[PDB]
Amino acid sequence: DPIRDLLIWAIVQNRRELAGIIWAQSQDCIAAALACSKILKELSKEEEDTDSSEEMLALAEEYEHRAIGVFTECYRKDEERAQKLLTRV
Amino acid sequence: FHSKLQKVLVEDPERPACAPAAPRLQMHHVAQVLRELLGDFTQPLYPRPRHNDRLRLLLPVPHVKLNVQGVSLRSLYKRSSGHVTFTMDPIRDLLIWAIVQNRRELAGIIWAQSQDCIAAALACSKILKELSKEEEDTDSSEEMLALAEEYEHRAIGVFTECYRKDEERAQKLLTRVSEAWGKTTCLQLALEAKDMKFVSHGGIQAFLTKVWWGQLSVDNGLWRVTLCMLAFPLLLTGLISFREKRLQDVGTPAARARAFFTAPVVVFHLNILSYFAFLCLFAYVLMVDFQPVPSWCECAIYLWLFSLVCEEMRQLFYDPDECGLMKKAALYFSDFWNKLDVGAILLFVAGLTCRLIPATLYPGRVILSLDFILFCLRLMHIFTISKTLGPKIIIVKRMMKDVFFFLFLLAVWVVSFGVAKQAILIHNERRVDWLFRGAVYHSYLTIFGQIPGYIDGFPEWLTVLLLCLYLLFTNILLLNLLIAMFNYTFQQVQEHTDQIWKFQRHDLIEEYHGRPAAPPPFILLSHLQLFIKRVVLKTPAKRHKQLKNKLEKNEEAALLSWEIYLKENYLQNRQFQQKQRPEQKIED
Amino acid sequence: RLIPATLYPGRVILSLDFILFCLRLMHIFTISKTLGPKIIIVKRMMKDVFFFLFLLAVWVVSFGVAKQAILIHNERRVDWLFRGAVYHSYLTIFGQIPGYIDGFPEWLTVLLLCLYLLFTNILLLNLLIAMFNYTFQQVQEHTDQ
Lengths: 89, 588, 145
Ligand SMILES: [Ca+2]
Description:
Chain C: It comes from Homo sapiens (Human). The structure is cut from a larger assembly and holds three copies of chain A. The first copy, chain A, is mainly α. Chain A is built from five helices and no strands. Chains in contact: A-B, B-C.
């Protein structure tokens, strides 16, 4: 599938628009955002050390905001399948 | 600034030139008004003597026929000394003129076309912070401090854009001498500007990390360098390898030893070793060798004590300049640590003299024992190395410097303990008071709480209940002061104690780096090389150990054009951000 | 203990291992609703002051040596057998100086021993509140995370 790997390609490249633009049509709604957040936080903790680390940490925790938003709207509806969602393989 | 100019013009005028006080505006007056705002910098563009003679150019002087006074090139005089078209460069001095005058626009307007991109901003920041700390005291000090730290923001911005491109020349940038700014390697001037954010901009971390390790690359751990240095042939085994071994530069074990010993980190752990070893040796020689005659252990402890005296000796001559020996050395030694440095030697000398005096044969040992506590202070004074304990050690340094007067408050207040408890019995001012108990001085307390009741076999308990309650009150009035003074600088320190850490690290290393690589066991070679060489010269002229480099003309121009180009890149980006904040939107 | 040289010291050595298990005692007790988050807080603070631990321990080494500077050391002597200086068990100087054999200057340096203890409260107890007071905001609601 293209989108799952294109998010991986775009996230390590550190932009605003492209990541969300690609995600807007992601088949895997929840796990891709979590994977992008993890990769991006690791890149934060590796090495930039000035002028970018805090901004792209804010972008990471924005991906956590957005994962919380999608989990909110999937807990709006269909609670049963909502809890079985949390074992996505 | 204008008041300072009037003062400097009235400090060194002459009588006949102009009546009230106005002989001329020369390099002298600007030179002093700068030297009161700087340290060891250079005097610009015309020293006094014959090669660049500006001595008597305030009265008529003899003409060419003597060829010794004036210009000695033109035989005509036109009531003027001439006109040099370009002094050195206009912008560097026009920033200096504008900054002391306290405006927003003009300083940046002039800087936008500065040839010297980085050093001029640092110099302006330093001068402006000194003017802040001198005297305005209301309505301006904080605003122009904000302007100063804005110049630090802007220096960080230009350093950002020069670390965007050409990393190699970017790190070699940080030794900018310019041959016109009082070189300062572009860092001594920077560190004199006190660098709130400047000393933590990434590239400077790489810089101070690669200069902290001389001939010592990556893949070395804090726990693993101790094994490398302690186990001496072990470095040649399959342990951590260096670029010398990687490039096969280790052709001789002697070469390996020379490369290792000259590493800066080696001398630090060496003085960590030798100082505690000398403390243990002092204990050993006090403990057994209580012989006034010079014995083996007596001379052994004399050796390293004399070596430490020689090191503090050398630091004391290096402290002042070539002319003022007493003044600035005493100014630096007015600090409590340096005063204790003097005291550690003076008390030892006094104790030795007292011990040689038959009156105090026995008290001499007790007096000499007290000097060890001073060395205990150096123990945690020098231990600014640990990654997590080190910043806390800077914190304890500053807090004890702050509560240096709470120390005396506590000590003087306690004087009302022994006197208050001893008010029951009659004093002995001209009596047999001394010999076994009297009241104060040093050793035989048996009232530690162990009152000697062994001879024994509504009212009376509560004032001695209130002795311990008054101790609880001591916890009230005094332990409160500790947390109180700590809780004034309690915010965002965990992340911004790194700035203070790096700053005292560099301040310490700037003068502690000029220490020989020869270990104390092998200090006799350096002694025979330099200490007997001293006497033939009035002033020691050894090569000064610094990280500065001499710049050639072609590399100077090739760099300077590059900083100018990246400065243009920074300026256009700057405009892009000045579009962004909503203030421009609202006035638009 | 099986070695005949340390038949008796083996029991003393084995007794020390119990303190390590004492650590697991409060390491595993992360269950209580209100004490549990505070136990995570104590876990992180002790992990942080793991080096203050060694600072405090090494600094104290200047207590017994400083008090014992009056008398001559015994490095190759009969030093051990009943008192010598350091290791484990027979302290009778808990403040109970054995004066039972007994029957302007001299009080204040041993006044300053307790004053120096107050100074220990100065240099060191400050570190506790100091390191705690760096993560002191909005924890009560965000220590749940
Ligand atoms: Ca001092």
